[PDB]
């Protein structure tokens, strides 16, 4: 990008990274808010989104995100980071 002498609304989505023990819900809260104000066009930023979202997620969360895959949606990810999503299913642990 370029041609911007001044456009510092809040172009800093790069600083929005999920801590190793940080809830994905709080991560997305800041991520989405900042990305919404990111100085880029929708298709441009959304292309980065799919990468950054997983990239700046911690290994543990990232492992969960990958186990779901692109076949699952953000809503699923939000619940996935919260545990398994639904206990009493496959009585292996609980």
């Amino acid at each position: 990008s370029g041609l911007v002498p001044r456009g510092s609304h809040m172009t800093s989505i790069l600083d929005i990274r999920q801590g190793p023990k940080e809830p994905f819900r709080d991560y997305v809260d800041r991520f989405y808010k900042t990305l919404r104000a990111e100085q880029a066009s929708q298709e441009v930023k959304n292309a980065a989104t799919e990468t950054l979202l997983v990239q700046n997620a911690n290994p543990d969360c990232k492992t969960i995100l990958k186990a779901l895959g692109p076949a699952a949606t953000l809503e699923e990810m939000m619940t996935a980071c919260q545990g398994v999503g639904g206990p009493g299913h496959k009585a292996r642990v609980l």
């Binding site: 292309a47 799919e50 692109p70």
Partner: peptide, 14 residues
């Protein structure tokens, strides 16, 4: 799983 999906998540629930 893009900004699109992020928007639909806050706006709707599917």
């Amino acid at each position: 799983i893009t900004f699109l999906d992020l928007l639909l998540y806050y706006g709707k629930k599917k």
